[PDB]
Symmetry: C3
Subunit: 149 residues, 3 copies
Amino acid sequence: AIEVKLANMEAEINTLKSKLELTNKLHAFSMGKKSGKKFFVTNHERMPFSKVKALCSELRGTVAIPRNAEENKAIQEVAKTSAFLGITDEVTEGQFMYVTGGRLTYSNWKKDEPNDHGSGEDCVTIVDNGLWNDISCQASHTAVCEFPA
Amino acid sequence: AIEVKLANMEAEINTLKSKLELTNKLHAFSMGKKSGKKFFVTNHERMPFSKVKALCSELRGTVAIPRNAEENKAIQEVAKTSAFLGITDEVTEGQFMYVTGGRLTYSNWKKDEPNDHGSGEDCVTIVDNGLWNDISCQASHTAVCEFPA
Amino acid sequence: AIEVKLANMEAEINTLKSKLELTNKLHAFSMGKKSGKKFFVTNHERMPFSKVKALCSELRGTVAIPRNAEENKAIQEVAKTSAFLGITDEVTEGQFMYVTGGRLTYSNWKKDEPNDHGSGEDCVTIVDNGLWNDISCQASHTAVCEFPA
Ligand SMILES: [Ca+2]
Ligand SMILES: [Ca+2]
Ligand SMILES: [Ca+2]
Ligand SMILES: [Ca+2]
Ligand SMILES: [Ca+2]
Ligand SMILES: [Ca+2]
Ligand SMILES: [Ca+2]
Ligand SMILES: [Ca+2]
Ligand SMILES: [Ca+2]
Ligand SMILES: [Ca+2]
Ligand SMILES: [Cl-]
Ligand SMILES: [Cl-]
Ligand SMILES: [Cl-]
């Protein structure tokens, strides 16, 4: 009994793991995930940067970051409005870095941006043109999370 | 060995449970669930109130109920068309009650409504502009379920 | 007590099985699955027929198959563009069959189709107005999968 039931439950657990993996594949598919491409998702809610980071972190994802023009357009299409990107110069003013770490390898700054305007701007929002504008991390913009290809 | 295998399997199960909860959170988010707000969702199918109740119950949710103007707008945008709300005045005519219990707090009745028109109207539909109209429970309207925040 | 921990594990696993089933049901509901009806899903990606089959099969579904006009309309609404159907005449030219078996019954061919045009056309796409056109299986069209009622 004991050992047989124990061996069975290991197979029951592996079966459930396979099923959950499949469920995740189906949900990603219905969410628009393209083959071998990272995908972006939003609940269309606007909130401050820290809340977006906490929200995407919970979902085991990260705040959306475009690494090229294609991804930048992908994020733009998903958000439909201004959306925070996972990029900030909070550590050293004027020096933008990915929240995941490192200096920028691609950018699409609007003319004369980033400018740390007025009282200060350490976050970044992709606007309705695909262009970028640094803005207050306290302002509320659309939450867009990113998941791996 | 046995006690160690069992311990290791309990660990795997806990991990699977967390992963499943993550799948549920990502799904709700992708479908528009707002932070700290109830999750409203529909399959766009129209059916009698009894069927709507059975359907949401089977999903472990309940027929959508607007507790305030914010929730009412939320349900309105998810439904798109006329949809049943989890409210009826089946016990005492004129006394609308939530299917989950309690007297109606918030309401958004249309002019000249509720009117218990014709042979009687004990159910409620959110219609145009998000206003409410009492209607026959046997009539077919969109099924919108709600899940907790 | 080993036996008590084992019985609890059995209860934990069964609880997970029920919860995963609920997650699958809720996701299908959110994706538009109507009661007693099969449902269709797409990620809007365009690809050759063999890729669509492979992808749908992996999700334990199949390339969408319109068995009647209601389903055809449903597939048309989900796809939004030209999409492959789970129907081909690869086995015997001129004789269309479902990928899962059986000779084609209901059909919605555009005038003068199918025509096995040029070097040949053994696949089928639902196009404009929801009508059908036989096309090369090597061409890339929208991937739409169907799942059981
Ligand atoms: Ca600063
Ligand atoms: Ca700055
Ligand atoms: Ca700026
Ligand atoms: Ca009555
Ligand atoms: Ca009444
Ligand atoms: Ca009425
Ligand atoms: Ca042929
Ligand atoms: Ca010919
Ligand atoms: Ca042919
Ligand atoms: Ca043709
Ligand atoms: Cl700031
Ligand atoms: Cl009634
Ligand atoms: Cl072909």
